[model samples]
Target: GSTDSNNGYKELTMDGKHTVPYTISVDGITALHRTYFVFPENKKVLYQEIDSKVKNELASQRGVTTEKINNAQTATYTLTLNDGNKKVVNLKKNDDAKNSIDPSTIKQIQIVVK
Candidate 1:
């Protein structure tokens, strides 16, 4: 069960068109919204609520510590929704992999609010 709604903030509207609520939660973390993006053929899309673990993943990808990673919040915690090709997404990254979600395929409209 989720204990926090990501700081009391839950739910999201995709592309200002659809209203999708979160479906599941892990260890007190839940997604802000459901995923409805129709992915492309060869690519995959991901939308997540960046938490401490997620931040650590990014840090691992970039070979940095969580503290060092968060220190550059302004520059690191950034996101952009995309259509899996040329479209740009505006998503907010989470601090942990707690809410890390996978679209599992190409995308039509992916959010990147990191």
Candidate 2:
């Protein structure tokens, strides 16, 4: 359950356009609004909030590799989205496999306001 509204904030409801009446701040810096999505059953889109575990799964599906980092491992993959955006996913590898956000999971078209 979620509150309907909060001061300087708007509640997120599933699958629709809504107004978020506040600034997103990171490290005291205001962040701009951007389109966000969940992993649809089709498995074809990338959202910044996607968990690393899921990312590794997607990367494994795409056959990516990892690099040794201080006795640990790191994985990275570059994906070209249908919207002409190049998105990069990086994660710390816990095993031989790696994962990333699948580009095909994205909706074919979406509207974004500038």
Candidate 3:
């Protein structure tokens, strides 16, 4: 998904019983940023499963983090990978209140391998 900033992010969604993989790239830079796999079904035990697989191998790799602004009613997932870089996906359930959004709402079930 391309956020408002025009930065690109790849996304995949999965139901509880199925799984898959996806390759994501920003622009034409493949390098170590080749592919990523996400399995929402295993989230209960492997919440950061994908992060563990590549964080150490990539330069400046970092784990995913969640953030919520005071009253924006928005949720954001920030992912950092390789060589001092980061990407994000934002979600909003409503334009009002302190709404909470689930990652599942974004349909996450796949993996990316480099």
Candidate 4:
């Protein structure tokens, strides 16, 4: 129901049953294959979940309407939606997190603020 989760991107993947692709091609004219040198974090950023500031960032951004749904290990947004906003919602390890970096899902991850 969402592409916005911190890990389950349908395009490039690396969470749960999803995995990463080391190469991608062009319009039948790649340099063979564009290589991906990035390392896939072994686990999702907190069980494929997001944080609080982010949860409200949207409630305050979109309409302050989409109430929160604590989907066990995740947050199921109570909105008229699909998963396009949950990507890169890293709340783990970043215990000192302040930056809300969720709007960058043109592709995503990482952020900071004081």
Candidate 5:
């Protein structure tokens, strides 16, 4: 159950877009309007709100391994979802892998989870 409106904020009602009067919180976290992130969390498209356990699973199975490559700014990180989907992310060579996908991380709201 949810309120129809709370200080101009409403419960997310449908999959389609709707008119919002004021702010939008994901029941707790507020959404920054007109902005979205395509940034990587463990080197794939993300919303940047992954849990530690979730990241750990992704890590334990086929986690971020610093493989040898030529690119200095981008290193290859192979991340696989539990669904058996594989996502190869080009992360910075200097960018730490354990730091990237963990809940001990930062930033973004992913519209596409690929």
Candidate 6:
């Protein structure tokens, strides 16, 4: 999900449900077909920031504010958020215990410092 160049951005993809087209032709001059090489990607590099150094490392770069919390020992924030709706509709995070690569729709996941 990291596409900022400064961060790590491994190739990630999402299932092309209805966007999969057999061939996209431009005025019938250029023809393009699906070769199963790459699919549409919905991945992103969710970012946050904390007030403390420890928490800052774990925080994502998407947040705009950092308030003192937890006795100021550390900071916490949501690393990932839903695609469009930040409420609770388009988010689905994986709850795997082994960190398996699976599709999920999560609103947000907290990143806390030790």
- How many clashes in each structure? 33, 11, 14, 7, 2, 11
Return the top candidate by TM-score. 1
Sequence-dependent TM-score of model 3: 0.23
Residue 73, model 5, lDDT = 34
- Residue pairs clashing, model 5: 46-110, 47-110
- Write model 3 residue lDDT over 1-114, tens digit each, in one string: 744777566656543433322333323333364444443432333334434444344424423222212233334444344233455544232221243332333333222221
**Which model, 4 or 5, shows the larger TM-score?**
5
Tens-digit lDDT string for candidate 2 (1-114): 866474666556764432222222222344344334444343533243454454375336433333322233333434445566654444342232333445343433222111
* Deviation of model 5 at 110, angstroms: 21
What lDDT, from 0 to 1, does candidate 4 have? 0.31
Off by over 4 Å in 3: 1-18, 30-50, 57-114
The TM-score values for the models, in the order shown, are 0.25, 0.23, 0.23, 0.20, 0.21, 0.18
Off by over 4 Å in 2: 1-49, 52-73, 92-114
lDDT of 5 at 8: 64
Tens digit of per-residue lDDT, candidate 6, span 1-114: 645657665654543431222222222233332232222245432221112342353234322234433223443234332364332211122233224221134433433332
| Candidate 5 deviation (Cα RMSD) | 15.8
- Assess the local accuracy of residue 92 in candidate 6 as a C-alpha lDDT between 0 and 100: 24
Residue 6, model 1: lDDT of 53
- Candidate 3 Cα deviation (angstroms), residue 89: 2.5
Name the candidate that leads on lDDT: 2
User: What tens-digit string does per-residue lDDT give for candidate 4 at 1-114?
Assistant: 646546643553533332222221222322333232232333334322454544464445333333322222332111111244433332223432544222212222322211
